[PDB]
Amino acid sequence: DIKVIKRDGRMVTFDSSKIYEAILKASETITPITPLIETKLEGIANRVVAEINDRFSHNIKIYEIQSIVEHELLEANEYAIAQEYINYRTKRDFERSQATDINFTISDLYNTQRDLTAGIVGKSVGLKMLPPHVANAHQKGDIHFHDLDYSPYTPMTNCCLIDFKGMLANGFKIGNAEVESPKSIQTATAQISQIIANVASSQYGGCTADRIDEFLAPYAELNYKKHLADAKEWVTEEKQEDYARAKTRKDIYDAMQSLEYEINTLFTSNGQTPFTSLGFGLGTNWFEREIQKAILQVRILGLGSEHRTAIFPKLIFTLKRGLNLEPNSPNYDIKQLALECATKRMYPDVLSYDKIIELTGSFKAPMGCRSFLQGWKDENGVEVNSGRMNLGVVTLNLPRIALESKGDQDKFWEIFEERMGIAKDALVYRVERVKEATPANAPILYQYGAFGQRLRKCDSVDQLFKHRRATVSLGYIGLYEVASVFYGSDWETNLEAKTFTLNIVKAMKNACESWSDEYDYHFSVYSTPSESLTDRFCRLDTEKFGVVTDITDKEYYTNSFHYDVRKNPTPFEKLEFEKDYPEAGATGGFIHYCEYPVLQQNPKALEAVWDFAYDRVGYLGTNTPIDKCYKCDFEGDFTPTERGFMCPNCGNTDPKTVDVVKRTCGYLGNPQARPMVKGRHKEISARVKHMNGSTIKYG
Amino acid sequence: DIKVIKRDGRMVTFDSSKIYEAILKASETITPITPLIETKLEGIANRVVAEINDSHNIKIYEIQSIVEHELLEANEYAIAQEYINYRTKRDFERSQATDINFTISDLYNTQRDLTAGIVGKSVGLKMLPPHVANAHQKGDIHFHDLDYSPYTPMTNCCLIDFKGMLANGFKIGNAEVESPKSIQTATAQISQIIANVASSQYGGCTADRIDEFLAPYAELNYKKHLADAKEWVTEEKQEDYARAKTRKDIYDAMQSLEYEINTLFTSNGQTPFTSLGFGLGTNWFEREIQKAILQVRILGLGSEHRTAIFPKLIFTLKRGLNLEPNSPNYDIKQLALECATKRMYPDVLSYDKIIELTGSFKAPMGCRSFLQGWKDENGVEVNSGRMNLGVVTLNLPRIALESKGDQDKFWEIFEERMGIAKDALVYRVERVKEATPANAPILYQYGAFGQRLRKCDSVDQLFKHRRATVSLGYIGLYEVASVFYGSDWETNLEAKTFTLNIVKAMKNACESWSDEYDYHFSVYSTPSESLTDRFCRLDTEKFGVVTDITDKEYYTNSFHYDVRKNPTPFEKLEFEKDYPEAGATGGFIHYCEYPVLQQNPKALEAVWDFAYDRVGYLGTNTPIDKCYKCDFEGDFTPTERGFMCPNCGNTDPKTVDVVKRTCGYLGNPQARPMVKGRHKEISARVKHMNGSTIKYGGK
Numbered sequence A: 001d002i003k004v005i006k007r008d009g010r011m012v013t014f015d016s017s018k019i020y021e022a023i024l025k026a027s028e029t030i031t032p033i034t035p036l037i038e039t040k041l042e043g044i045a046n047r048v049v050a051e052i053n054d055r056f057s058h059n060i061k062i063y064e065i066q067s068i069v070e071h072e073l074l075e076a077n078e079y080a081i082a083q084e085y086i087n088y089r090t091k092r093d094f095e096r097s098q099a100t101d102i103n104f105t106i107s108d109l110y111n112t113q114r115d116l117t118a119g120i121v122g123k124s125v126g127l128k129m130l131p132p133h134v135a136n137a138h139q140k141g142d143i144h145f146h147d148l149d150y151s152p153y154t155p156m157t158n159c160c161l162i163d164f165k166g167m168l169a170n171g172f173k174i175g176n177a178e179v180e181s182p183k184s185i186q187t188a189t190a191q192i193s194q195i196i197a198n199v200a201s202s203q204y205g206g207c208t209a210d211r212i213d214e215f216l217a218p219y220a221e222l223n224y225k226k227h228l229a230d231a232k233e234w235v236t237e238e239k240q241e242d243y244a245r246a247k248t249r250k251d252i253y254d255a256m257q258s259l260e261y262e263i264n265t266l267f268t269s270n271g272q273t274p275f276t277s278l279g280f281g282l283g284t285n286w287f288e289r290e291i292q293k294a295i296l297q298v299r300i301l302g303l304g305s306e307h308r309t310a311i312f313p314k315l316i317f318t319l320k321r322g323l324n325l326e327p328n329s330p331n332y333d334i335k336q337l338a339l340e341c342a343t344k345r346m347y348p349d350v351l352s353y354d355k356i357i358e359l360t361g362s363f364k365a366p367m368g369c370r371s372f373l374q375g376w377k378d379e380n381g382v383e384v385n386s387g388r389m390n391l392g393v394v395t396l397n398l399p400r401i402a403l404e405s406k407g408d409q410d411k412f413w414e415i416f417e418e419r420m421g422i423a424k425d426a427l428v429y430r431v432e433r434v435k436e437a438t439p440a441n442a443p444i445l446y447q448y449g450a451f452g453q454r455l456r457k458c459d460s461v462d463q464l465f466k467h468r469r470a471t472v473s474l475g476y477i478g479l480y481e482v483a484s485v486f487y488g489s490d491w492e493t494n495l496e497a498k499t500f501t502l503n504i505v506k507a508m509k510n511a512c513e514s515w516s517d518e519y520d521y522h523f524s525v526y527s528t529p530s531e532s533l534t535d536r537f538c539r540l541d542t543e544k545f546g547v548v549t550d551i552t553d554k555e556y557y558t559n560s561f562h563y564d565v566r567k568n569p570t571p572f573e574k575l576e577f578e579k580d581y582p583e584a585g586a587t588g589g590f591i592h593y594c595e596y597p598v599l600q601q602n603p604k605a606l607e608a609v610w611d612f613a614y615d616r617v618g619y620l621g622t623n624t625p626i627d628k629c630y631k632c633d634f635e636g637d638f639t640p641t642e643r644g645f646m647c648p649n650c651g652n653t654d655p656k657t658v659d660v661v662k663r664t665c666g667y668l669g670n671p672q673a674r675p676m677v678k679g680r681h682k683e684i685s686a687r688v689k690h691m692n693g694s695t696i697k698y699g
Numbered sequence B: 001d002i003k004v005i006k007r008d009g010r011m012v013t014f015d016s017s018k019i020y021e022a023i024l025k026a027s028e029t030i031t032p033i034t035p036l037i038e039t040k041l042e043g044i045a046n047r048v049v050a051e052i053n054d055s056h057n058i059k060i061y062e063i064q065s066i067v068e069h070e071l072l073e074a075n076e077y078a079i080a081q082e083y084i085n086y087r088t089k090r091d092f093e094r095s096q097a098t099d100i101n102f103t104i105s106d107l108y109n110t111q112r113d114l115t116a117g118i119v120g121k122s123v124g125l126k127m128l129p130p131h132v133a134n135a136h137q138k139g140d141i142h143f144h145d146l147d148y149s150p151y152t153p154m155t156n157c158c159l160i161d162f163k164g165m166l167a168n169g170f171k172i173g174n175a176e177v178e179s180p181k182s183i184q185t186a187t188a189q190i191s192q193i194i195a196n197v198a199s200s201q202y203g204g205c206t207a208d209r210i211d212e213f214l215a216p217y218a219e220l221n222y223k224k225h226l227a228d229a230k231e232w233v234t235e236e237k238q239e240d241y242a243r244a245k246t247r248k249d250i251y252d253a254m255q256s257l258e259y260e261i262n263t264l265f266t267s268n269g270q271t272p273f274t275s276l277g278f279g280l281g282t283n284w285f286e287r288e289i290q291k292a293i294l295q296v297r298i299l300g301l302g303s304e305h306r307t308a309i310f311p312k313l314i315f316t317l318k319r320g321l322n323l324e325p326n327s328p329n330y331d332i333k334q335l336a337l338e339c340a341t342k343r344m345y346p347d348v349l350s351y352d353k354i355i356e357l358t359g360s361f362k363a364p365m366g367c368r369s370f371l372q373g374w375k376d377e378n379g380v381e382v383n384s385g386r387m388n389l390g391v392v393t394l395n396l397p398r399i400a401l402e403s404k405g406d407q408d409k410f411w412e413i414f415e416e417r418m419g420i421a422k423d424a425l426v427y428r429v430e431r432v433k434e435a436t437p438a439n440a441p442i443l444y445q446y447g448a449f450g451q452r453l454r455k456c457d458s459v460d461q462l463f464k465h466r467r468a469t470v471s472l473g474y475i476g477l478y479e480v481a482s483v484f485y486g487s488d489w490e491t492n493l494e495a496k497t498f499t500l501n502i503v504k505a506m507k508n509a510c511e512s513w514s515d516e517y518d519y520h521f522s523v524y525s526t527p528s529e530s531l532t533d534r535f536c537r538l539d540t541e542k543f544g545v546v547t548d549i550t551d552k553e554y555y556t557n558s559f560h561y562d563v564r565k566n567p568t569p570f571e572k573l574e575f576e577k578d579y580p581e582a583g584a585t586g587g588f589i590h591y592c593e594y595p596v597l598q599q600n601p602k603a604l605e606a607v608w609d610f611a612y613d614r615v616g617y618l619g620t621n622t623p624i625d626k627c628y629k630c631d632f633e634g635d636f637t638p639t640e641r642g643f644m645c646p647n648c649g650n651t652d653p654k655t656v657d658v659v660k661r662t663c664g665y666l667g668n669p670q671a672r673p674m675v676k677g678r679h680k681e682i683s684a685r686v687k688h689m690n691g692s693t694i695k696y697g698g699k
Ligand SMILES: Nc1ncnc2c1ncn2[C@@H]1O[C@H](COP(=O)(O)OP(=O)(O)OP(=O)(O)O)[C@@H](O)[C@H]1O
Pocket: A004, A006, A007, A008, A012, A013, A014, A015, A018, A019, A022, A062, A065, A066, A069, A089, A136
């Protein structure tokens, strides 16, 4: 009946076990278990709760709780405990409040240090600006806020899928100069790259060009018409048209080449390359087919004189039955080319047109690392898919919720509901803070139709995202460790644990549905990728809960809901087992990786896996061993070590001569020039092949 | 011969006047000036110096203690305690510079650029040697761009060896790319190269003789077109066709470059300063490239044909090539003249005058920073591939005010400040030498500075033997001349001898320093980035209003003629030709304002020809403003903080186009309004040839 107000302000519940555990840790800090002490501590714990429910009756602040516990335990003739209690209190408070911009950092790039310092000062200011309880929980790692380096210090926006059709149809303004529709395809891709540059400068997330072929076809047609007019002017009467064709094809290639190099040599205010993506696969006429062929060709040819594989843009390849799925369909050549590209380089992904439409709500290329949106017919009734955004994400700790329960389901749900309360508060604060961005502040995104509509300076920014137009995502991770700590390491054979995971995901989805219906903004459960947050998550978890079996001894946390990477099942059963996790209602973001051996000579196996996977689950990623050592000339996979990689034959590790690329985030990266955290390193080292076969290509 | 160590590190000579002045000033704040009181203070100061002379190397804290004790013995409390409190107030303000600075329309990327700048400035001020730090903060000198340096070992500007990169290939981001095969790829490579260079140096960037090194790639493109037309067109017009096609291609390539400069936004968020130099076209391809660049500049940017504020265009005039009407390049100069009267750019550079002034001809880097003739160990002259290392500006007008109309003490204090500046230069170059090539591999170990280095080797080997340069700046020759020899000193000859003596002493000091430290130090005329604002504000606060010195709330830039009176351009040039030839060689430019020169560029041609033999660098300031609401061309009336059309009055940047030359690069005030230290000087700029400044009214 009584309720407790907290240092933060959350009307948390009241219990008697937590105080006991607190005194036990306090006593163990210096004194050993000492069964006498261990047993006597129950006595003064019960004395403390007796004091609180006899003296106070309704609303207790933390202040009096602290005073009562110290006053009562002092008389236990146990000064070696009270002093340590106050010691821990003061040391924490000092360490928590010693998080100001006075932080000292007294072989890397130059702009990266400046942006690192800017991010540090932004983090300090933001943590000083956040609401109390959410900030406290983030500091203890109960929930992981996202991108403190940019938000909420500034009204940033996470990731938006640009509407290039509106740009290239109506024109826009960049820097000092406005632009009119392009008159060719080379200029078209050039200004597409420029828009990518400016948008990525004015945000902190992804940049996805959806259905590039469909909106790039008319400009290729314009180029072909111009070339045909020139041919009529000069070329002979017998073979004009062919000329155009051939020349047009070359132009297409040229244009795409520019793109493949323009956004590869592009660094924002952050020294890190912005995360981008391209999508294609809905081509009917000749021009779209040629543009897809050109994109795949420039990808497979590689970059540089050393034929090094490319990292960006992210490439997807939508697959639609009756268009590019079967040998009879008039696109099998495009699928063959894309499949060869897949077996040679770790790209592209696939989009199951029919099943993604059925499950997600419509057909929308993965905006950013993995966040899919939701269908949204507009005011006029026409569905709009280009111009949406994502106001933010934030990870909510599942495994700590599980492991704090200590083998009880009933406690799990109440801690879950409380966390969700904190997550709701954080979500509301983030969207409200974003809602305070003047359009004139960043005209590239608002004032000139980046999000699909053009708004005057005097207008506000709510009109762009209201009525479930924008999305805010809430995130989860660890499903496997939750199920393992609750039902044992090997739980996939049984069904009760799987129903447990399905039920908890369903509860999350229902909570997001209620929130979305209440606040009018769309809220979706979203499988947050582990770029480097998994290392901080694991480190805080092992600092708080020690070392436990199979949950933390791996120094990393299994991303989202994927199978345990230590296990090696066939891909078929992997998709069969995972097909229901996002189907149940977790469609916010998903990515299924099936591990291969080197199939450059046998990409037919990859083809079979992709086909079978059409009806099971939409997204699909491929991990083929494609690294290479330039000095000794070797291709295949590299044996991981302790804090890097090395080629099994020699051992050269200098990135100047060895190209290794691993699917570290949802987007792959180079673990040689940008040494990531220890956790991702260990997790990559643990990944186990998922299809038996040869790996080494040429020693 | 008594030595006193100053507060920080200076061993300045001792005097008794400053002691009186200090006591008099300490009396002024409360006690009003009266002959009795000032005579009392003089007696006290005489007592103080008597006590001082009552072993010869005294500290400063001792002097402060002495003055406190004697002022107390003078049986007056107000002045002494006020002096002490002024000392505490200043010291608290001297220490108030800490990251804690709270900065709690301003586009997203900026705010963090500004915060990083303030943090770097605070760290650098706390880092650099003490005495020059005090000199800088007190306004004695100005250290340039304290935000970027010496927090990071940056560099000012350079002539990137575009020839070396485009010949032997280079690595950018993740791709090691070899030489191009077409002019479009060549200019795309140039744009990417400069974009990635600008993220590794604070100051400007430039490329010289662009056509001269771009000719072979134009030839390659023409060869490819001819080969492809060998079988695809009739035998008679084949060659002709190629020509036409190649011409258009060249235009296209250059077009791309222009826009690819406008869309550059580094971590600073302000477009990097960038200059292009050409004019040595001999064969057909270089002529075509020059024509293309001039055409793409006159045609403007965007559908609104708004002028390009960037990049800088420098056109070199050579006798016997593009000067006489019979010369083989007069049409190129006609296009250049039309471009110069329709838009601000380009500027000029006489071959003979420049090669005589600074050894060997080379386009300036940055705003106006020039170089000196250099030869390497192999006796081969090279200009592209050498770099600057930043400037620090002196303050002549402060010295003039401190002289109190006395010539003899002026040179003593000037020598003192000169030594301070030497210490500053030495520290800056030493700090730069502490960098490592791996910091910015593009800028150092991939040809951007000429020689290609290795990781294991340092960078000093790229700077010794007077290859790099460390320029030292000056400002306000007119200010000191006006303070000394009256306001109207132009007709007088003695004052001219005096100011040229200042420049000569500066040159001699620079020459001695260069001979000693093995790095080419040079005199320099500082571009008014922000120096006018800060210098004028500090001088007005300290020395108060002075007629024709600070009442204009602006400081005359370098040696330039007075901006408040209008002589004929020919006589301006004949008066100004003495300054750079006398030794002011490190950087210069001669502004020459004209009315609307449309429908008659003959006056512009005449002044250019007249300025060939006299000076090296000259710029034109014809009014080019335009307003779109009422369709007006001409000039805009300055106002308290901006500009507007004299007919209607609209002033927003979205519909007006006002451009006025500041610090070399044009810049548009409506986009980014400069501080009110320059805006009061551009308003004070007076047309320098009679004629209408309007071109067309609207309604
Ligand atoms: N559920 C609970 N209700 C009330 N008091 C509790 C509960 N759990 C622990 N306590 C008591 O709260 C005391 C305060 O812990 P602490 O000093 O961290 O304060 P706090 O308000 O919890 O601050 P924080 O949120 O930063 O942890 C503990 O020493 C313990 O005795």
